[PDB]
Each structure stands twice: as structure tokens, then as C-alpha cells.
Design an enzyme around this catalytic site. Structure first.
Site, short mmCIF file in Angstrom:
data_model
loop_
_atom_site.label_atom_id
_atom_site.label_comp_id
_atom_site.label_asym_id
_atom_site.label_seq_id
_atom_site.Cartn_x
_atom_site.Cartn_y
_atom_site.Cartn_z
N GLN A 19 26.05 12.29 -15.40
CA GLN A 19 25.05 13.12 -16.07
C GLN A 19 24.24 13.91 -15.04
OE1 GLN A 19 23.04 9.48 -17.66
NE2 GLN A 19 21.18 10.70 -17.33
N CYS A 25 21.62 11.21 -20.91
CA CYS A 25 22.43 9.99 -21.11
C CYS A 25 22.82 9.89 -22.56
CB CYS A 25 21.64 8.75 -20.69
SG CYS A 25 20.09 8.52 -21.56
N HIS A 163 17.84 4.12 -22.43
CA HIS A 163 19.07 4.60 -21.85
C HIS A 163 20.15 4.43 -22.91
CE1 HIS A 163 21.74 6.10 -18.89
NE2 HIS A 163 22.33 4.96 -18.58
N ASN A 183 28.86 3.53 -18.56
CA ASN A 183 27.66 4.33 -18.25
C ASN A 183 28.05 5.79 -17.95
OD1 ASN A 183 24.96 4.95 -17.61
ND2 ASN A 183 24.81 3.42 -15.97
C1 LIG Z 1 18.91 9.18 -20.41
N1 LIG Z 1 19.26 9.71 -19.31
C2 LIG Z 1 17.47 9.09 -20.76
N2 LIG Z 1 17.26 8.18 -21.89
C3 LIG Z 1 17.30 8.51 -23.20
O1 LIG Z 1 17.43 9.66 -23.59
C4 LIG Z 1 17.17 7.37 -24.19
C5 LIG Z 1 18.33 7.63 -25.18
C6 LIG Z 1 17.71 7.04 -26.49
S1 LIG Z 1 17.89 5.24 -26.43
O2 LIG Z 1 17.13 4.70 -25.36
O3 LIG Z 1 19.30 4.94 -26.52
C7 LIG Z 1 17.04 4.72 -27.91
C8 LIG Z 1 15.80 4.11 -27.83
C9 LIG Z 1 15.17 3.72 -29.00
C10 LIG Z 1 15.72 3.92 -30.25
C11 LIG Z 1 16.95 4.54 -30.34
C12 LIG Z 1 17.58 4.92 -29.16
CL1 LIG Z 1 19.13 5.66 -29.30
C13 LIG Z 1 16.24 7.58 -26.39
N3 LIG Z 1 15.94 7.49 -24.96
C14 LIG Z 1 14.70 7.46 -24.42
O4 LIG Z 1 14.62 7.32 -23.22
C15 LIG Z 1 13.48 7.58 -25.30
C16 LIG Z 1 13.44 8.85 -26.12
C17 LIG Z 1 13.39 8.84 -27.52
C18 LIG Z 1 13.37 10.04 -28.24
C19 LIG Z 1 13.40 11.25 -27.55
C20 LIG Z 1 13.36 12.58 -28.28
C21 LIG Z 1 13.46 11.24 -26.16
C22 LIG Z 1 13.47 10.05 -25.45
C23 LIG Z 1 12.20 6.99 -24.75
C24 LIG Z 1 12.90 6.32 -25.94
C25 LIG Z 1 16.58 10.31 -20.53
C26 LIG Z 1 16.43 9.08 -19.64
#
Ligand SMILES: *C(=N)C1(NC(=O)[C@@H]2C[C@@H](S(=O)(=O)c3ccccc3Cl)CN2C(=O)C2(c3ccc(C)cc3)CC2)CC1
Length: 216
Positions: A19, A25, A163, A183
Site C-alpha cells: 500500500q 489498507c 487495519h 497483509n
Molecule cells: C490502513 N492503512 C488504515 N486503516 C484503516 O483504514 C482501518 C480500516 C477500517 S478497520 O480498521 O478494518 C475497521 C474498524 C472498525 C470497524 C470496521 C472496520 Cl472495517 C477502518 N480503519 C481505521 O483505521 C479507522 C477508520 C474508520 C472509518 C474511516 C472513514 C477511516 C478510518 C479508525 C477506525 C489507514 C490506517
């Protein structure tokens, strides 16, 4: 359920991607999941554009290189009528303006399924569907320097995930069970891009807390 599953063996899984220095991610987990379901449908394994997701799924709730959700990416694909192959819409590790070409599209979905929030339900899904998008707490520095073996972090959260990654299977090597996770940090991290995450140790790092897959 079977004692072990590995979708890599059955041809559902593209090589490990990277990425880079962009927080996308979530886009890799979603393409990973769609790649699996498309292959389950067509027998053709075709790599997918994370850039198409990063540039174009703002309307659905995603925030480009600052993060997003796998389900929002799956909703975008359903809204949009499709997704471009990785060949046509190459990855840049930067947010740029949208460029979806309907002709260059190789995938679609009819929505997504949210798996019940238990490891048993995850195992059922991984064994019967194919690769599954999952959220994990990857915030600990132990995860950054992971090399081999079953990943276990005593300080991991079951509720605070940051993540998006892809479960491609599970297996066993006391405390010997694991999820096989792809990953998106390229092939030089972990086990050629993969991590074995502790399985059946009270939803370790939240692996079953937000698991989903697209319907095709
Ligand atoms: C990846 N490089 C990065 N992480 C994320 O974008 C990560 C992806 C989802 S999740 O962590 O899989 C998640 C968490 C809670 C509920 C469902 C899911 Cl799928 C969201 N991620 C986040 O880091 C957060 C996030 C949530 C919504 C939005 C619009 C952006 C970020 C902080 C929860 C970027 C580092």
C-alpha cells in the site's frame, strides 16, 4: 468445520501487494475479498484497482489515504456498476481524482454480508465462502516487526481496530491455532506478506469484530 483451510492453494489469492505510504489498507482488503469472490464465480483470478477504490469511494464514506471501510468499498462497487482491473487503473499511493472507465471493469457485486461477531462465525465463513475482509488491532509495535510464528499480543484490543486485512484460511501448528492473514505491506514484511494471528484466544486483536465479504 475442517481443521485447516487455505484459499491460496485453490487459486483465490493474488500475490502480496504494497500500500506504500498511503493509508489505503481498507482498499487492499476489499480488492482481496472481491478477487476471491470473483474467482469463485468466474475461475479467472484478476487483480483489482485499489486506486479505483481510493479515488472514487469518497461518496460512500471512505477517506482515501486517511482510511476507510471495506463495506464502503463493497457498496461503492455495487453503486458504481463495477470495478476496474489493476492493470487498467494502476496504484499510485496518493489520492488523485477519480478515473473509472466502465469498459475497463472486470468485477461487480450485489452487496456485502456482515459476519456475526464471533470466531466461530468467522471460521464458518472462511471455510465456506473464501477469503474474508477483517479489521484488526495492528496498532502494537509487535505487529510492525512480526516475522514468523503465531502472532500473539497480550495488549491487543478486541474492540479497537485500525487495519483492514484479509483472512485466507486458518490452521494449527497449547495455544496452537491461527488465522492465516494476508497483509498489504508487501512481501518483505512477516511471512512473505502474511501473518498467522492467534485463533480462538478470545477474539484476539478483534479479528472477528468486523468481518465481511462481498456477494457476487
Ligand atoms: C490502513 N492503512 C488504515 N486503516 C484503516 O483504514 C482501518 C480500516 C477500517 S478497520 O480498521 O478494518 C475497521 C474498524 C472498525 C470497524 C470496521 C472496520 Cl472495517 C477502518 N480503519 C481505521 O483505521 C479507522 C477508520 C474508520 C472509518 C474511516 C472513514 C477511516 C478510518 C479508525 C477506525 C489507514 C490506517
Amino acid at each position: 468445520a475442517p481443521r485447516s483451510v487455505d484459499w491460496r492453494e485453490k487459486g483465490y489469492v493474488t500475490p502480496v501487494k504494497n500500500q506504500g505510504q498511503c493509508g489505503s489498507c481498507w482498499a487492499f482488503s476489499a480488492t482481496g475479498a472481491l478477487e476471491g469472490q470473483m474467482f469463485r464465480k468466474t475461475g479467472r483470478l484478476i487483480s483489482l484497482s485499489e486506486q479505483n477504490l481510493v479515488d472514487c469511494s469518497g461518496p460512500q464514506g471512505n477517506e482515501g489515504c486517511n482510511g476507510g471501510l471495506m463495506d464502503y468499498a463493497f457498496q461503492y462497487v455495487q453503486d458504481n456498476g463495477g470495478l476496474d482491473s489493476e492493470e487498467s487503473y494502476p496504484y499510485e499511493a496518493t489520492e488523485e481524482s477519480c478515473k473509472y472507465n466502465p469498459k475497463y471493469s472486470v468485477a461487480n457485486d450485489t452487496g456485502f454480508v456482515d459476519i456475526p461477531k464471533q470466531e466461530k462465525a468467522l471460521m464458518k465463513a472462511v471455510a465456506t465462502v473464501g477469503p474474508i475482509s477483517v479489521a484488526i488491532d495492528a496498532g502494537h509495535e509487535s505487529f510492525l516487526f512480526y516475522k514468523e510464528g503465531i502472532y500473539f499480543e497480550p495488549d491487543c484490543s478486541s474492540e479497537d481496530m485500525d487495519h483492514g486485512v484479509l483472512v485466507v484460511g486458518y490452521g494449527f501448528e497449547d495455544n496452537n491455532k491461527y488465522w492465516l492473514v494476508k497483509n498489504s505491506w508487501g512481501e518483505e514484511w512477516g511471512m512473505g506478506g502474511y501473518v498467522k494471528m492467534a485463533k480462538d484466544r478470545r477474539n484476539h486483536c478483534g479479528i472477528a469484530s468486523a468481518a465481511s465479504y462481498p456477494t457476487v
